[PDB]
Amino acid sequence: LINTSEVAKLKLLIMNFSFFVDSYIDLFGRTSKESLGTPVPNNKMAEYKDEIIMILSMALTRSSKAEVTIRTLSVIQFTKMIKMKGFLTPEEVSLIIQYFTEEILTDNNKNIYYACLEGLKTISEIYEDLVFEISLKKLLDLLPDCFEEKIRVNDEENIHIETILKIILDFTTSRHILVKESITFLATKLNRVAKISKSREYCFLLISTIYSLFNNNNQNENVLNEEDALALKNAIEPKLFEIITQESAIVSDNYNLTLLSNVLFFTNLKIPQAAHQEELDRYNELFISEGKIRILDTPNVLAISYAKILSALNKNCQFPQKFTVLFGTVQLLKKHAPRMTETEKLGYLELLLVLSNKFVSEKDVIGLFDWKDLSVINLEVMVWLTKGLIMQNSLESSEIAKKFIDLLSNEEIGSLVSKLFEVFVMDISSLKKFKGISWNNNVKILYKQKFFGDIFQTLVSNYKNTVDMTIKCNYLTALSLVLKHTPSQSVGPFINDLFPLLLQALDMPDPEVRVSALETLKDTTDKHHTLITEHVSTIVPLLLSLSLPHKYNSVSVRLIALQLLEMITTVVPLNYCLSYQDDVLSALIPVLSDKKRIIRKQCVDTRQVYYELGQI
């Protein structure tokens, strides 16, 4: 144990002392929450603590940044010091926290960055209060009042705005107090910057970070307790309603409003059952009964947030005003349809979906049905009510959708309804069966498969018995838009009938339809083989043409087409494969010369496979 400046001697000293630290751990033990007060009796390591701390600091600090290995070893040894019981006083661990924060802020090298992150996580899980006091507060203080300012971490080093937010995202992933304080500070900063400044990118980044913090911790159901979540909501809710009610700069943007509504839904998700009714009554009074904002009198974007508000309350709650608000929103949506923007319309339709799927019974929903008037907005309302009905997997829904198929037979309404048919199966970013809690909504896991089973038979029967290509195209669009969202592994019975329609679907404006059909036929050739052998003569030219660049062929579509070329080459016998060798090689030359990189590699692999098949 002699101080030195040579890198090799210092490294050997670190490696040698890395066994003495383990010896000390074995002799005494490891740090624990209950054992934070009882000290070790005596040892000769304590007398050498100053020297080892000093040499470790010299290894980490005042040293050339080109020796990353020395710094990594130093931070690992510091973490091991944190691990061992009864060795470091609170001031020493605070100083180590300071070194870790300075290292992670000043330097951006990945190895040292992740080593410091691991050390900070260990310190947080052993000492959350200190890491919150020294590290978290400073990181929150670095971010400025105005967007795109000059952050002065030190005399020379300046750090990007997104770097601090990413650092906050990384750790505190399972620390209760740290994430609570971070959420509170981020909400306060967002409110203040929106009140005093008019910026979009900064507010969007802050709201996205808050949403990420809620999402990454709601996935474990243990970071935040019920009473702690209630306290956090009580602290955050007025300071978000202040920005919501005022014009600010987030209302004018749909994305910021959607993210804040998702944040409100997340923070209202974790509520004890004793306060759900009072919160529902207060929200009803604030949004409808009283207040300047009247979503049922004047159209506005704000209503969409109300939907995200309602999706978090308990399902089995007393909701006396359900039919009245339903009728009011339906009448307003019908009356102001030509003038309302798409954002307000989507918000009102989401509100309709929430009301249909959560509170109102099926009898009222079917009572609000009117098929006589074939107006576009009536189609919107009908489809979005029946989607919520299907979410409940009601018995009547399996019949109601059938009427839609008949309604698809219309001339001037067939195309619009066929295009809009995708709404029936679609993610809403607010309604899933979260693990644990199950009373949030009434969505069923197997609704997609049941709906596809009830719909595909009628769709294929009608498509196979039609002469004019307009109705055929409408039917194909309806089936394809249903198919693009349903799970791929959940369609096995219908493969034989859907295969010709699957092939027909490969000419569609939507790239999602193309990629879904490509993946489905990949599964087909994985599990079936006769269909591929009989239809190769048409499949190969279609895939060959799909690989060429087009306004509708995305990179995923082309890559999956090349992978399907791999599968069809592997599965189809050699005799048929030799018949389609020259053309594939000839037409794939303009594919590996495209803008993208992964497509080039996949095309090279396909060329090599096809070339090697010829000789063997």
Binding site: N393, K435, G436, G453
Partner: protein, 167 residues
């Protein structure tokens, strides 16, 4: 109040799931609170190539439909019967097990509600009528109808009166 702790016990049993297999079958069919999730998983195992797990899943589905009341089957009948028809067309073996599956499905649907059973029967007849009209897969359709009508006297009379005039 097991519904509060629902979805937590499913994972460990499905992890333990593939000689001594009857205990898992009994446990997975204890309460109807399994049903709305159980099928969602078991149907996936219907895609497995190995026939042993296929037979095991058929037995689990038999124990499921036998002791999940009438509502769960009245909700999942379309998808389950579609999968059973698919595996019939693909082909104590699997065949007798799935024929008994169809028979007990019909018996349960008849026992729960007459209207729902009638809708089931007429949908099956409408979908399988072209097989009688054509000359394709007569044996499978005949065996499926035999299983459907092998439940009770009333179902047998209904299927006989609705089937003989066809052929």
């Amino acid at each position: 109040n097991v519904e509060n702790f629902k979805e937590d016990l499913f994972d460990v049993l499905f992890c333990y799931f593939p000689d001594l297999k009857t205990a898992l079958r009994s446990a997975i069919t204890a309460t109807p609170l399994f049903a709305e999730d159980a099928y969602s998983n078991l149907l996936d195992k219907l895609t497995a190539s190995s026939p042993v797990v296929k037979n095991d899943t058929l037995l689990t589905l038999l124990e499921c439909v036998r002791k999940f009341g009438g509502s769960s089957i009245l909700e999942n009948w379309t998808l389950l019967w579609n999968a059973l028809k698919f595996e019939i067309m693909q082909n104590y073996t699997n065949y007798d097990a799935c024929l008994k599956i169809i028979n007990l499905m019909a018996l349960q649907l008849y026992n729960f509600d007459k209207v729902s059973f009638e809708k089931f029967f007429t949908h099956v007849l409408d979908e399988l009528k072209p097989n009688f009209k054509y000359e394709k897969d007569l044996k499978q359709t005949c065996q499926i109808l035999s299983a459907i009508g092998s439940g009770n006297v009333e179902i047998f009379n209904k299927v006989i009166s609705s089937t003989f005039p066809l052929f």
